[PDB]
Design a protein around this motif. Structure first.
Motif, short mmCIF file in Angstrom:
data_model
loop_
_atom_site.label_atom_id
_atom_site.label_comp_id
_atom_site.label_asym_id
_atom_site.label_seq_id
_atom_site.Cartn_x
_atom_site.Cartn_y
_atom_site.Cartn_z
N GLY A 118 44.06 55.57 23.81
CA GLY A 118 43.21 54.46 24.26
C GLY A 118 43.73 53.15 23.75
O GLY A 118 44.76 53.15 23.04
N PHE A 119 43.04 52.07 24.09
CA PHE A 119 43.46 50.68 23.80
C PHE A 119 42.68 50.08 22.63
O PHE A 119 43.05 49.02 22.17
CB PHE A 119 43.31 49.84 25.07
CG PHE A 119 44.43 50.01 26.05
CD1 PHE A 119 45.72 49.62 25.73
CD2 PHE A 119 44.20 50.52 27.31
CE1 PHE A 119 46.75 49.76 26.65
CE2 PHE A 119 45.23 50.66 28.23
CZ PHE A 119 46.50 50.27 27.89
N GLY A 120 41.62 50.72 22.15
CA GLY A 120 40.85 50.15 21.03
C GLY A 120 39.41 50.61 21.07
O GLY A 120 39.15 51.69 21.63
N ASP A 121 38.53 49.84 20.45
CA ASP A 121 37.24 50.36 19.94
C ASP A 121 36.04 49.67 20.59
O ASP A 121 34.93 50.05 20.23
CB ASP A 121 37.21 50.21 18.43
CG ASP A 121 38.34 51.00 17.79
OD1 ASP A 121 38.74 52.04 18.38
OD2 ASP A 121 38.82 50.57 16.73
N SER A 122 36.25 48.68 21.46
CA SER A 122 35.16 47.95 22.16
C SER A 122 35.58 47.75 23.62
O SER A 122 36.78 47.80 23.90
CB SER A 122 34.84 46.64 21.49
OG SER A 122 35.83 45.65 21.73
N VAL A 123 34.61 47.57 24.51
CA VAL A 123 34.88 47.27 25.94
C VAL A 123 35.80 46.04 25.97
O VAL A 123 36.81 46.04 26.70
CB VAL A 123 33.57 47.05 26.71
CG1 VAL A 123 33.81 46.39 28.06
CG2 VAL A 123 32.78 48.34 26.87
N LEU A 126 39.87 46.10 27.37
CA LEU A 126 40.24 45.25 28.54
C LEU A 126 41.31 44.23 28.13
O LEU A 126 42.26 44.06 28.92
CB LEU A 126 39.00 44.56 29.12
CG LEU A 126 38.06 45.48 29.89
CD1 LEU A 126 36.70 44.83 30.07
CD2 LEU A 126 38.66 45.87 31.24
N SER A 127 41.17 43.60 26.96
CA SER A 127 42.14 42.62 26.39
C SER A 127 43.51 43.30 26.22
O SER A 127 44.53 42.76 26.70
CB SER A 127 41.70 42.06 25.07
OG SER A 127 42.60 41.05 24.66
N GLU A 128 43.49 44.43 25.52
CA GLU A 128 44.72 45.19 25.17
C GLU A 128 45.37 45.68 26.45
O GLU A 128 46.60 45.48 26.59
CB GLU A 128 44.36 46.32 24.20
CG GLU A 128 44.19 45.82 22.79
CD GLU A 128 45.47 45.22 22.22
OE1 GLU A 128 46.55 45.63 22.64
OE2 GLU A 128 45.37 44.36 21.36
N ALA A 129 44.59 46.26 27.36
CA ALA A 129 45.08 46.76 28.67
C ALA A 129 45.81 45.61 29.39
O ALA A 129 46.98 45.82 29.86
CB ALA A 129 43.95 47.34 29.47
N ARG A 130 45.17 44.44 29.46
CA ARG A 130 45.76 43.26 30.17
C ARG A 130 47.06 42.86 29.47
O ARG A 130 48.08 42.60 30.18
CB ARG A 130 44.77 42.10 30.23
CG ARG A 130 43.68 42.32 31.27
CD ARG A 130 42.93 41.04 31.57
NE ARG A 130 42.03 41.28 32.69
CZ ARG A 130 40.75 41.64 32.59
NH1 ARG A 130 40.18 41.78 31.41
NH2 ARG A 130 40.05 41.86 33.69
N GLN A 131 47.07 42.87 28.13
CA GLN A 131 48.30 42.50 27.39
C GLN A 131 49.42 43.50 27.71
O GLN A 131 50.54 43.06 27.96
CB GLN A 131 48.04 42.42 25.89
CG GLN A 131 49.19 41.76 25.15
CD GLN A 131 49.38 40.33 25.58
OE1 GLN A 131 48.43 39.54 25.59
NE2 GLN A 131 50.60 39.97 25.95
N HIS A 132 49.14 44.81 27.71
CA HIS A 132 50.16 45.88 27.94
C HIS A 132 50.68 45.79 29.38
O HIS A 132 51.92 45.92 29.61
CB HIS A 132 49.58 47.27 27.62
CG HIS A 132 49.58 47.57 26.16
ND1 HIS A 132 48.61 47.08 25.30
CD2 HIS A 132 50.41 48.31 25.40
CE1 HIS A 132 48.86 47.51 24.07
NE2 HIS A 132 49.93 48.27 24.11
#
Length: 113
Positions: free
Chosen positions: A20-25, A29-35
């Motif tokens: 997964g990308f992290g621990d909060s919605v 979404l932030s991490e997904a957009r960065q990747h």
């Protein structure tokens, strides 16, 4: 540009090392957009028993429209304990960090950025 042409490596769920990308919605979404921007984002196709093998919150790509240059138009929707943040079309899969797993395929998408 409001949209970016991406080719996402399709990963088998059992190969994924970072589930997964992290621990909060907001963080996933932030991490997904960065990747997605850094070309370090993979796609797992959702079938029976896939999501329980990944970490919540989930980030989905969902069809946003009915496909320029072969690229399906998609947007991001997150899910945490059965609640989705965003509203879009059919799920194309769940996003995960890509850290060098061998893909089985590529999924061409036009990402609303």
């Amino acid at each position: 540009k409001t949209h970016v042409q991406l080719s996402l490596p399709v990963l088998q769920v059992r190969d994924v090392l970072v589930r997964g990308f992290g621990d909060s919605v907001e963080e996933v979404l932030s991490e997904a957009r960065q990747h997605l921007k850094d070309g370090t984002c993979g796609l797992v196709e959702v079938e029976k028993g896939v999501l329980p093998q990944l970490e919540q919150p989930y980030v989905f790509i969902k069809r946003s429209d009915a496909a320029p240059h072969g690229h399906v138009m998609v947007e991001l929707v997150a899910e945490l304990e059965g609640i989705q943040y965003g509203r879009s079309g059919e799920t194309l899969g769940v996003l995960v960090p890509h850290v060098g797993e061998i893909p089985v395929a590529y999924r061409k998408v036009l990402l609303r950025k």
